[PDB]
Design a protein around this ligand. Structure first.
Ligand SMILES: O=S(=O)(O)[C@]1(CNC2CCCCC2)C[C@@H](O)[C@@H](O)C1
Length: 658
């Protein structure tokens, strides 16, 4: 079908443009699609892009509008006072503002479908909301419509919600165009997606991106595939990965690096209302926060992540129990058997389950997938699915059987309800992953596992040493391996913080010199230095010149391979704001060779200061561009929970940053 209306080059400068004569006599039938290509790099706090209204006195609540906020939110209102209808649909963090110094051309598509009674909004190729209603209100059937407006809504002859921006193209169709059709509309996106709703992971949500450039030139990314909305554990979360062989132009279909099957992989639209949004999958095991390094020695890629047993998260994990019994030099995974109130068992060599109370072996063994065997045979549990059919979250058996895992709720033998760190490896650069193995405890029998710092581990240039930063109360705990991850030891570095989420990332400044940058509770990013290849660590200092909130945000960090301004360069990625997770920046620092101090010389704004930017991943692509994969939303805000396709990837060049 053809647009009944098509116009462009509309400058919105706090003055509505009336297009009533061009549009009103052509609105026909009860279904409409609006396609709008627009820019808004300096929007007012709340502004209408498009409006259809009854403009007469006494009918100020009879209008349809497409609006946006300076937070990046997009939405519509559909109101008819005589029909008693006041629909408001919206989603935070739906828009781009600027990219590489220029206003981004957003592509917006809104479908009002009478036949299915559904209102669906797409922005930049992403469906941000789709709402079906009992009583449908066609946008052209609003009682007394007599004005079509750009850059405002006309109410009682007055302009409301005045917009600043530009509508470069707007088209209206007297049809609800299909999802298939929407997919054919040309986009001008400054970003691409690696992980996305509906892909192979079947997670509707993603969080905690990573990026790492392998020696082959392949770029690898890992991520939390989060099923129960965007909530941290407890939940159902798997670790997924994808790789690019063409400097980030295209990405492979995701696979799992670490997964559990106690709950079904379900694509679920998690409720965003104020009654149900804290609904949380509470009976599932999960992985959370992954980190990647490549080992020169073996050529293996190594991925670590936190492991959470069923129903466990960092809020309810036992802080005073490692889950391992130390017996003469060795650490054995403790198990509790159904019926017992204590942990009377351990897993010894060859997976044998040993009764600690009789000092004798049982006929149970644990396999390499942490599954339970009895006399060599696989025990099973019934899998769970989740639904909101009853108006609240329900977790229930679905009739499918899966291998019994010691991390599961229904298992005969259960691990200690605390957090662990697991490792997996890949021999083919991310095409497949090994079964995970638990790392040993590093802080004794009576201390929970440390928390993995999301992002990259560090492979030292002049040795085969591998380092993964972790944090716990009062210290950073670096996990160090010199034998391709076969064995590990800790190096503790005290930090003057009680129970801080001290997410840390490292760069090798020069041979044997490591600087770690980390999140704090002070509003400032901190750092410490090793000249020991990680053996010992300096006192803590702070970067003055970048602001975080009181609660802080993960910071990603790389050492650039090329000189900038004749100096060695470190690039940081972080929100730069004392209010929320927004105002994302790359910050380029130049290293002063005399004291290893860094002058933070250039700040590049990823998008508008008011637009969302949370956890992030950066890596130098093999062609010396910078790849950035980041959460484009405020992942702290309780208004921006459960958003799909907000983890996005961009390509930048150094000249863009300087
Ligand atoms: O120097 S490495 O530590 O092996 C690494 C890769 N360096 C190449 C050097 C050549 C250009 C691309 C980046 C940097 C980290 O951010 C990881 O991406 C791995």
């Amino acid at each position: 079908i053809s647009p009944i209306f098509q116009g462009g080059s509309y400058q919105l400068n706090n003055k509505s443009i009336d297009i009533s004569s061009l549009l009103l006599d052509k609105l026909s039938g009860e279904s409409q699609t609006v396609v709008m290509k627009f820019k808004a790099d300096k929007p007012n706090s709340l502004q209408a892009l498009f409006g259809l209204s009854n403009s007469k006195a006494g009918f100020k609540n009879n209008y349809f509008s497409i609006f946006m906020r300076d937070s990046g939110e997009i939405g519509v209102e559909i109101r008819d006072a005589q029909k008693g209808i006041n629909y408001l649909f919206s989603r935070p963090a739906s828009l781009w503002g600027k990219h590489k110094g220029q206003a981004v051309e957003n592509t917006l598509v809104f479908v009002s479908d009478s036949k299915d009674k559904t209102y669906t909004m797409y922005v930049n190729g992403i469906e941000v909301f789709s709402e079906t209603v009992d009583t449908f209100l066609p946008i052209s059937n609003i009682n007394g419509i007599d004005k079509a407006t750009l850059g405002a809504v006309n109410r009682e002859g007055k302009e409301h919600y005045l917009a600043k921006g530009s509508i470069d193209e707007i088209s209206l169709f007297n049809k609800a165009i299909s999802d298939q059709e929407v997919s054919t509309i040309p986009l001008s996106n400054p970003f691409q997606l690696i992980f996305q709703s509906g892909d192979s992971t079947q997670a509707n949500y993603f969080r905690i991106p990573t990026l790492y450039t392998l020696s082959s030139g392949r770029v690898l990314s890992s991520i939390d595939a989060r099923y129960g909305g965007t909530h941290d554990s407890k939940s159902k979360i798997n670790i997924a990965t994808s790789y690019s062989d063409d400097n980030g132009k295209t990405w492979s279909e995701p696979i799992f690096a670490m997964k559990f099957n106690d709950y079904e992989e379900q694509l679920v639209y998690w409720p965003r209302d104020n009654k149900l949004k804290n609904s949380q999958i509470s009976g599932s095991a999960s992985f959370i926060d992954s980190s990647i390094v490549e080992d020169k020695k073996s050529g293996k890629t190594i991925l670590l992540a936190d492991v959470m047993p069923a129903g466990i998260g960092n809020n309810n994990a036992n802080k005073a129990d490692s889950g391992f019994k130390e017996i003469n030099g060795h650490y054995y995974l403790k198990l509790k058997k159904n019926g017992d109130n204590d942990f009377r068992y351990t897993v010894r060599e060859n997976g044998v389950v040993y009764n600690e109370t009789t000092n004798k072996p049982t006929n149970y063994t644990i396999n390499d997938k942490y599954e339970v065997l009895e006399g060599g045979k696989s025990l099973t549990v019934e899998q769970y699915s989740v639904d909101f059919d009853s108006g609240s979250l329900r977790e229930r058996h679905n009739g499918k059987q899966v291998p019994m895992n010691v991390f599961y709720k229904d298992s005969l033998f259960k691990v200690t309800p605390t957090n662990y760190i697991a490792m997996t490896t890949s021999q083919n650069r991310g095409e497949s992953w090994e079964q995970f193995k638990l790392l040993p405890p590093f802080l004794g029998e009576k201390h929970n596992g440390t928390y993995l710092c999301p992002g990259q581990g560090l492979a030292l240039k002049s040795s085969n040493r591998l380092i993964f930063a972790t944090y716990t109360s009062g210290e950073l705990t670096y996990l160090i391996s010199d034998d391709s991850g076969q064995t590990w030891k800790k190096s503790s570095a005290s930090i003057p913080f009680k129970n801080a989420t001290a997410e840390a990332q490292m760069v090798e400044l020069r041979d044997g010199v490591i600087r770690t940058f980390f999140r704090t509770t002070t509003g400032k990013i901190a750092y410490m230095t090793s000249r020991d290849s990680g053996e010992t660590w300096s006192k803590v200092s702070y970067i003055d010149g970048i602001q975080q909130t009181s609660y802080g945000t993960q910071v990603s960090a790389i050492k650039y391979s090329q000189l900038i301004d004749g100096k060695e360069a470190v690039i940081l990625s972080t929100p730069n704001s004392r209010s929320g997770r927004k105002g994302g920046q790359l910050v380029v620092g130049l290293v002063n060779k005399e004291d290893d101090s860094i002058d933070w010389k250039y700040h590049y704004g990823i998008d508008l200061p008011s637009y969302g930017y949370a956890y992030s991943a950066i890596t130098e692509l093999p062609n010396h561009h910078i790849g950035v994969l980041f959460e484009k939303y405020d992942s702290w805000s309780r208004n921006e929970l459960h958003l799909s396709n907000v983890v996005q990837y961009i390509d930048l060049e150094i000249n863009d940053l300087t």
